Symmetry: C2
Subunit: 129 residues, 2 copies
């Protein structure tokens, strides 16, 4: 049956997308999108806004806009650990990881500039002393 | 001696500021600032940029600009736990807290809008199933 062959296909495409962490791409989202995975614009709209892309929108302005930087809590922790510099490279205090987190928020997902790096290094030195 | 009385005063003001998590306000920063804590503009410049305010700048544009929203990792975890809704209210998977983190970065420290809330709720439901 072309119906079951259609449900399996949507399920297959959706599984592929979610394995990559593309969470909006459910089998129903994929059905609505004409039984195909997201176009470049749909992916980049989602990546940059975290809103579910309309299956019936193409997002042509997000196909060739390229800012797009964001940090997970792992990335934030690796940045904070590098800046803090504790012996045996142990985790920084939570108060420090929070200042680093807020820097990534201020910068829309980008990492600390030079001036911010100085603030963070100043902060780290007070917390170790 | 007015010198020791000056060092104690700077130390006193600085201790007060750092107890509040105002980390740039070292005793040396306080000395340079004419032996006073930060003005409203200096605090708000720091809060909104995370750069050490110049002791010899007043930051008049930051005295009456009021966006200023930011989230610690505690706030992010409380938002993620509320949205995820696991029994006994146990911590969400790290992959979920990371999607919530990235939403706060996209929004410059503000919390998820309605469209983003839908994405996150969709995400939570896939991770529990």
């Amino acid at each position: 049956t072309p119906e079951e062959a259609q449900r399996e296909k949507d399920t297959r495409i959706s599984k592929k997308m979610e394995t990559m962490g593309i969470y909006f791409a459910t089998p129903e989202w994929v059905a609505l999108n004409g039984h195909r995975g997201p176009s470049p614009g749909q992916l980049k709209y989602w990546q940059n806004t975290r809103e579910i892309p309309d299956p019936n929108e193409d997002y042509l302005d997000y196909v060739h806009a390229e800012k797009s930087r964001l940090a997970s809590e792992e990335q934030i922790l690796r940045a904070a650990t590098s800046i803090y510099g504790a012996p045996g490279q142990a985790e920084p205090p939570q108060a420090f990881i929070d200042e680093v987190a807020k820097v990534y928020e201020i910068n829309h997902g980008r990492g600390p500039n030079q001036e911010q790096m100085k603030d963070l290094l100043l902060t780290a030195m007070e917390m170790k002393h």
